[PDB]
Amino acid sequence: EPEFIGSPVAADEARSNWPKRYGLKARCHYRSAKVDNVVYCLGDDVYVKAGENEADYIGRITEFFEGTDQCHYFTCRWFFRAEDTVINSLVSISVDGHKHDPRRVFLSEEKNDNVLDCIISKVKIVHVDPNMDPKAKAQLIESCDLYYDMSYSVAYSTFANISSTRTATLLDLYSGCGGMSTGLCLGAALSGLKLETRWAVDFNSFACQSLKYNHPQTEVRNEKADEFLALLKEWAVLCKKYVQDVDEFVVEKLVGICYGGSDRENGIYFKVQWEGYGPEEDTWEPIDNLSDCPQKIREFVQEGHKRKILPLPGDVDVICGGPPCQGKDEKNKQMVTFMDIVAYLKPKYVLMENVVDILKFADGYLGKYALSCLVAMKYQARLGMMVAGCYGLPQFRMRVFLWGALSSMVLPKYPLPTYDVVVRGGAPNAFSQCMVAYDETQKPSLKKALLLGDAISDLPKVQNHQPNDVMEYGGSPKTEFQRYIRLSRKDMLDWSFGEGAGPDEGKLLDHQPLRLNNDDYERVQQIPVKKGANFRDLKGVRVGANNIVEWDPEIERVKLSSGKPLVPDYAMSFIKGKSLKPFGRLWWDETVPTVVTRAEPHNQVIIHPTQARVLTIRENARLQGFPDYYRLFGPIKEKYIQVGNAVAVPVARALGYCLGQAYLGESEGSDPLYQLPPSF
Ligand SMILES: Nc1ncnc2c1ncn2[C@@H]1O[C@H](CSCC[C@H](N)C(=O)O)[C@@H](O)[C@H]1O
Numbered sequence: 001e002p003e004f005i006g007s008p009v010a011a012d013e014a015r016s017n018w019p020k021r022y023g024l025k026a027r028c029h030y031r032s033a034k035v036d037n038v039v040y041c042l043g044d045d046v047y048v049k050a051g052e053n054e055a056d057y058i059g060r061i062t063e064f065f066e067g068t069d070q071c072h073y074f075t076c077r078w079f080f081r082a083e084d085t086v087i088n089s090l091v092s093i094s095v096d097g098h099k100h101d102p103r104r105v106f107l108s109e110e111k112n113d114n115v116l117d118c119i120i121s122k123v124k125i126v127h128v129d130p131n132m133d134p135k136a137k138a139q140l141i142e143s144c145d146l147y148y149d150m151s152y153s154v155a156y157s158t159f160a161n162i163s164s165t166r167t168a169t170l171l172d173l174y175s176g177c178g179g180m181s182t183g184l185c186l187g188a189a190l191s192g193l194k195l196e197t198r199w200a201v202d203f204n205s206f207a208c209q210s211l212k213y214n215h216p217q218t219e220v221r222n223e224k225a226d227e228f229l230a231l232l233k234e235w236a237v238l239c240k241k242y243v244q245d246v247d248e249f250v251v252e253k254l255v256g257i258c259y260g261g262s263d264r265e266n267g268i269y270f271k272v273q274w275e276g277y278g279p280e281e282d283t284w285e286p287i288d289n290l291s292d293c294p295q296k297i298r299e300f301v302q303e304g305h306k307r308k309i310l311p312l313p314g315d316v317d318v319i320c321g322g323p324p325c326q327g328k329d330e331k332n333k334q335m336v337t338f339m340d341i342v343a344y345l346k347p348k349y350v351l352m353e354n355v356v357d358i359l360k361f362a363d364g365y366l367g368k369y370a371l372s373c374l375v376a377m378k379y380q381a382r383l384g385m386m387v388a389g390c391y392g393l394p395q396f397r398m399r400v401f402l403w404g405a406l407s408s409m410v411l412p413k414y415p416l417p418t419y420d421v422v423v424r425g426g427a428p429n430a431f432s433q434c435m436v437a438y439d440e441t442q443k444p445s446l447k448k449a450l451l452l453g454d455a456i457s458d459l460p461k462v463q464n465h466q467p468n469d470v471m472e473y474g475g476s477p478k479t480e481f482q483r484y485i486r487l488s489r490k491d492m493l494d495w496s497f498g499e500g501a502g503p504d505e506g507k508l509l510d511h512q513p514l515r516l517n518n519d520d521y522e523r524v525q526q527i528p529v530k531k532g533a534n535f536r537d538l539k540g541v542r543v544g545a546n547n548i549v550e551w552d553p554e555i556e557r558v559k560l561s562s563g564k565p566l567v568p569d570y571a572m573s574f575i576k577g578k579s580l581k582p583f584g585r586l587w588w589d590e591t592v593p594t595v596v597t598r599a600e601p602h603n604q605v606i607i608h609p610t611q612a613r614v615l616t617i618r619e620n621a622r623l624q625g626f627p628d629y630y631r632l633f634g635p636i637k638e639k640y641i642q643v644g645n646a647v648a649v650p651v652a653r654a655l656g657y658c659l660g661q662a663y664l665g666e667s668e669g670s671d672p673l674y675q676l677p678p679s680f
Helices: 136-142 179-191 205-214 225-243 294-307 333-345 365-376 452-456 480-485 518-526 569-576 617-623 636-645 649-663
Strands: 032-035 038-041 045-048 057-066 072-080 105-115 125-127 146-153 158-161 166-173 193-201 219-221 251-259 268-274 283-286 319-321 351-355 382-387 398-403
Touching: 045 072, 057 105, 072 146, 158 382, 166 179, 166 333, 179 193, 179 319, 179 351, 179 649, 193 205, 193 649, 205 219, 205 636, 225 251, 225 294, 225 333, 251 283, 251 294, 319 333, 333 365, 351 365, 351 649, 365 382, 365 398, 452 480, 452 617, 617 636
Parallel strands: 105 146, 125 146, 166 193, 166 319, 193 219, 319 351
Antiparallel strands: 032 038, 045 057, 057 072, 072 105, 146 158, 251 268, 268 283, 351 398, 382 398
8 A cells, every 4th residue: 555565675776776866865765666456666657646637647667765754755757748748739730631649658758756645557658669560550559558659858849769972852842042942952962962952932933033043953833832732732643644554826835834823713724835936925724725635744744754843742852941921820821831731742851940939929839830740740850949140140040940850760950059159048938948059068169250341341342323233253252251152052062053163153143232212322321431320420419318319409401402301200200219220330340130131221220331332132142141152133122032031041051961961860869959060
């Protein structure tokens, strides 16, 4: 009843075995205990009593001991239900046919000590293993109270396997210009893996064209994730049909396929080229519209399949996504779709970038939804948050990355910071322990934090109107960074081209700011060149409790040539008056917390330190860690955006490396984070 069975107390290997007491205190230990009718040995799985109304704990018994105080205790290490994880309440999720097994568990190494009184019963918890066959599993499972395939550690919300050259394809969704995608592909080389973005999906024409130009041999789809998927399913159907074992105007050839977005009759349409008509006369026609013509379709598909113009589940070996889910469910269906596509394609890995708020919004509804969906599919997962700066950028940009590695594959870690930028985690609650940093190990990365001067310093002077994509540097890269930022695709291994040089060798691209309508231009004209330039330096001025800007009587307004004033009324209103960023300029020793999609000086302190103009697109690209050889297209504003949205290339490029290691399975275990060997 109430107490310990008895037997040696094991002389002492007790201290040898577990001397945390022997300094929890132990008179001695036992290998068996008797509660009610029954005796529990060590290594027995058991149900334990939580607080009233709480679910019973589960445990593996580790310690049975006669602690001083004279009490009889046992310490078991804990077992985990998905609803006890970070993901509580999101067990209610289903993606496709995937649902959370109600009896399944994840094995922490987390232990606590209790009196034997709290032992309800003892449970059979069986351990699985990925490699098995129909019924090897089905047996076990059908014979057992519970099972565990993986350990859940809370450090990174990591669910991973527990025991008890080379090419991989990539799918970039919400690709934009492909900052993440490229960077990843660059790290892959360091790992020594050849990761190719065989597909990219984004619905913006311009982001798409940037991308394609910079990775010509990739299939760039400009459409929506929805359309893409549906298109994806139907295509599978076709491959079934045409591939092998049977499963007035004249259309000449079929150059394309889609599930029409604007074309929007929700049906497969095919691009049409017809005799006498240039590519400009082509049109999209519904599949049924097409006549019996096999040769056109049969050939189109067969030859497409050969070229893997489109993914099948078997072939995608990584996939990343940026799904915006701007903002239960309101829109955000975008994040949901991401997981729908993943669910379909079963990539060997998954990576997801998102703003930190995923975790803040309602207690990471979104974040826990992504995580939950991941695990529901039996996918090794973990997620942690990284700062762009730590990887050598003149900015502090914190975002969240979700690693989805398969059961059959290693789970990539996260790389530790390469720079000394000081990170004070907005480190929400549930996710407070998901972050990448050095706790207080003097990792030495003098890696003098980058500052603006270092980033844009070698920069031919340019003014408010510069309509030239490609100018010349007419200067040598003057800092370690800058010297690094302009490097041949060959030296950075962009590799997209065939071992031949890329276009735009040694050129300078997209160096040009947006044009301020003259009113604004003039306003920037009068901005001073001092360190702290703000509109405050301008005719009319203020002081007060607020620092609030109130016009300075005695001096009346002004007129631009147009007669508009210099100081718009809005500028005065901000924050009710803060030094603010209105028409503000930055120094070389300044950092941007984050590069923003939209550069207009009105509120953002975006104007070049010495030049009278807004930080040029390229200046932001460098700021975002873009190689100087990455070309951007479309209206200046549009590519300004393309850059704003992008995930920093150095960060993504470290990711690419850790991953790379993983795909080829070289790395330690159970360590949330890596450290990079050269400058990686
Ligand atoms: N409904 C949708 N369908 C397809 N793409 C969408 C979409 N809604 C948003 N997007 C994509 O979301 C992207 C913004 S985030 C893209 C950042 C990207 N990882 C990079 O830095 O390269 C946009 O490029 C847009 O193409």
